[PDB]
Structure 1
Amino acid sequence: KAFAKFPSSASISPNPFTVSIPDEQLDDLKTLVRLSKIAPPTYESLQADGRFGITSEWLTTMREKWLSEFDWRPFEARLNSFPQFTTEIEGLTIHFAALFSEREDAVPIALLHGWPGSFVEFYPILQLFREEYTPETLPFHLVVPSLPGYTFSSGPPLDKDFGLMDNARVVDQLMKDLGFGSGYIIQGGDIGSFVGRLLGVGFDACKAVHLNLCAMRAPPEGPSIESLSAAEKEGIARMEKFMTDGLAYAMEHSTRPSTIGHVLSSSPIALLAWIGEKYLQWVDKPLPSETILEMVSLYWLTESFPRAIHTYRETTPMLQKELYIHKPFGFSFFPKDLCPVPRSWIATTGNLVFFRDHAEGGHFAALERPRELKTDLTAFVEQVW
């Protein structure tokens, strides 16, 4: 119960949450893994560079590991190693993990995941904080919500559409419910950066926003592409290849969410292939194979996929004007994330007072470079709060 006490000004009741998947669901996962079939080998599945997606070799070995090496129980205990709670907001059950400080002056921060991630993405950073602070000295309140449609959060609604602004509104309400209406900071990557920008733009209690993703076109009023350094041009080139060769999954989520939702719900191996591809291609250094299995299993056991992808019709269907962040705005750049835009471009989308360049790390910043992201966020808060 260390770090678990709600701040003094929270208005909601603490409802402690524990992950406890019944053995039957685990047995059924294994059964469905076993019954699943692998594609016959094809020219494309035999390409070791994986330019056409996951290889037969990888899927074959991952499937065997899932049946024989994988154990949910230690990962689950790890999920349960931090304080978690649920609360209801607009009739939605909203799950969140948290490290709450006992200091009255602690800066409230919400850290926002995306797809195919989750609240667990931030666990390595929570771990560093717990190794390095006590509840008495912890300088921040660290709130890690599950966004509507993900894992232990319910939703989105069945009877109406739901988008990025609805996600933002829920996050702000959580922060308000926990006692943070006088101010909070947002850390956001992936879909959480879209949500974080909206909080910065339109929500008075959001005082500052740090992002590790700024997906954007060339700014209308410049600077132009030719003003970019050779290295920044390499980044734009990587982004353009992502935008042309790497976005088909997102356009399927966007245009046919119901179809792909059913497709990936039918077999755990379908889900692994689709989500596994991104955990392979979107990082700098390869993740442990068990981490991929853990994340995919988490999605499977919570039926996350068909619920989570609603925002794709908004993210993958103004940054200088309507969605310009007037508040203190920070950015951490990791080169192997998918949209490596230059600082000069990012600077046009908000009041950029803080920028950190990194030599390594890909899309899953919190998982891949937890120290660098924690350090960057800490410096940002110390600068602007």
Structure 2
Amino acid sequence: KAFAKFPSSASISPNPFTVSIPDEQLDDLKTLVRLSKIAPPTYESLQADGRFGITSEWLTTMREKWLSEFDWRPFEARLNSFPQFTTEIEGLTIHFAALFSEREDAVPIALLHGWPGSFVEFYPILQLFREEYTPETLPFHLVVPSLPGYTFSSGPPLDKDFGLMDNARVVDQLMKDLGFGSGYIIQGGDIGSFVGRLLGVGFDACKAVHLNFCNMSAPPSLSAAEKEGIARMEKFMTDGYAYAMEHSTRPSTIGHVLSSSPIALLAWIGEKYLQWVDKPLPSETILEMVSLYWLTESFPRAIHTYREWVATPYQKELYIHKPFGFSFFPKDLVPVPRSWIATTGNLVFFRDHAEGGHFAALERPRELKTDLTAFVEQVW
């Protein structure tokens, strides 16, 4: 009960989902955390500024915390605190969390995660809505899908390639399944932003798009603050992008590498949870997200989009003609200015923020929630 009732217009039946990881799997994870090896200290791993990636000190400390302090059960209970479901789309099990309104006039919204995130990223925002409204007063339907290849969603297929457009098709079908064929809005960050762009461009039921991320180069006058943002983008694309190039070019190899040991996964993904935020996340949060990826074998399956994600498409064929909104966080990965973003769509809404990094839903949930709400109010 509570926010779990499917809209009357839904053409699918509710199949409630509960996260229940067997003790054996948790025992196995713990054994592999302990028996995984740690690299000998090197000049690079002894750099306190972490300019070469995660330090020996950080990895050692996190390993110890994972073994002695981390408990999966309370996090799992939190996962299960919100309505979750699965439905089958093109032979894929598509997982989603949701808060459904009882209002007939509620605006449907799907909120789309990226890598190395998941549906969990949006739990703080869902919690804010749940605190502030009843099912009778909730102004929106809030759908948080697990994209193909992530966590409790299966896929992508083994027998054919799968890309960004395929991801968009699945999200659009899910929204139609839930009864939102008459119209929905998309909120997207990271890879979810590109999926959101494709929904805005190519799918009629998508009526508007709000993004908190746009990776673009100079479009075919700038303030010092804007130039700083461009400098950060350039550093990310030149010094911070090797992981993405590996995902793009050799997904099978890196998939196997990070599946081999949970310490491998922690190092690779943990680096990004450290570097990509404004204010440091709790170490517990990093362990939760990494453990979630480990236990669902997310990494090797989720990275399929990189070979497409990594010419002026945004100003032409991928221009968002529908109402387009943007939330700018200064410590995001590629903080391009408003004037650049405006060339990529019908930008009718732009929110600037003084603080916050890449994981906006985790770092600045109140700002992202209120920005999104304001955008919907303006355009719907």
Q: What is the TM-score with the length of structure 2 in the denominator?
A: 0.99
CA distance in 1, matches of 2:3, 2:47: 48
Aligned to 2:134: 134
Aligned to 2:195: 195
Question: Which ranges of 4 or more aligned residues in structure 1 deviate by more than 6 Å?
Answer: none
SS at match of 1:97: strand
Structure 2 alignment gaps of length 5 or more: none
User: CA 1:192/1:275 → structure 2, altered by over 3 Å: closer, same or farther?
Assistant: same
Counterpart among 216, 223, 244 of residue 250 in structure 1? 244
1:31-82 deviation line (CA, Å, top 9, x unaligned): 0001011100000000000000000000000000000000000000000000
1:225-276 deviation line (CA, Å, top 9, x unaligned): xx21111111111100100000000000000000000000000000000000
CA distance in 2, matches of 1:241, 1:66: 32
Determine if the alignment matches structure 1 residue 284 to structure 2 residue 256. no
CA distance in 2, matches of 1:324, 1:283: 29
SS at match of 2:126: helix
CA distance in 2, matches of 1:329, 1:316: 18
**Is the 8 Å Cα contact of residues 155 and 307 (structure 1) preserved in structure 2?**
yes
Identical positions, percent: 98
Structure 1 alignment gaps of length 5 or more: 221-226
1:94-133 deviation line (CA, Å, top 9, x unaligned): 0000000000110000000000000000000000000100
Offset of 1:165 from its aligned partner?
0.1
Offset of 1:217 from its aligned partner?
1.0
CA distance in 1, matches of 2:301, 2:342: 34
CA distance in 2, matches of 1:238, 1:144: 30
SS at match of 1:359: coil
**Is the 8 Å Cα contact of residues 254 and 316 (structure 1) preserved in structure 2?**
no
Offset of 1:316 from its aligned partner?
15
**Is the 8 Å Cα contact of residues 329 and 355 (structure 2) preserved in structure 1?**
yes
SS at match of 2:315: coil
CA distance in 1, matches of 2:203, 2:187: 15
**Is the 8 Å Cα contact of residues 200 and 207 (structure 2) preserved in structure 1?**
yes
Aligned to 1:351: 346
**Is the 8 Å Cα contact of residues 198 and 323 (structure 1) preserved in structure 2?**
yes
CA distance in 2, matches of 1:110, 1:59: 35
CA distance in 2, matches of 1:357, 1:234: 15
CA distance in 1, matches of 2:67, 2:339: 49
**Is the 8 Å Cα contact of residues 162 and 304 (structure 2) preserved in structure 1?**
yes
**Is the 8 Å Cα contact of residues 219 and 312 (structure 2) preserved in structure 1?**
no
Offset of 1:170 from its aligned partner?
0.2
**Is the 8 Å Cα contact of residues 265 and 300 (structure 1) preserved in structure 2?**
yes
**Is the 8 Å Cα contact of residues 251 and 316 (structure 1) preserved in structure 2?**
no
1:331-380 deviation line (CA, Å, top 9, x unaligned): 00000001000101100100000000000000000000000000000000
Query: Alignment RMSD, CA only?
Result: 1.3
SS at match of 1:37: coil
1:202-223 deviation line (CA, Å, top 9, x unaligned): 1000000000001101111xxx
**Is the 8 Å Cα contact of residues 95 and 152 (structure 2) preserved in structure 1?**
yes
Equivalent runs, 1:147-226 vs 2, <5 Å: 147-220=147-220
Determine if the alignment matches structure 1 residue 335 to structure 2 residue 333. no
User: CA 1:316/1:14 → structure 2, altered by over 3 Å: closer, same or farther?
Assistant: farther
Aligned to 2:359: 364
SS at match of 1:329: strand
Aligned to 1:56: 56
CA distance in 2, matches of 1:340, 1:72: 35
User: CA 1:275/1:384 → structure 2, altered by over 3 Å: closer, same or farther?
Assistant: same
SS at match of 2:6: coil
Aligned to 1:295: 289
CA distance in 1, matches of 2:312, 2:2: 41
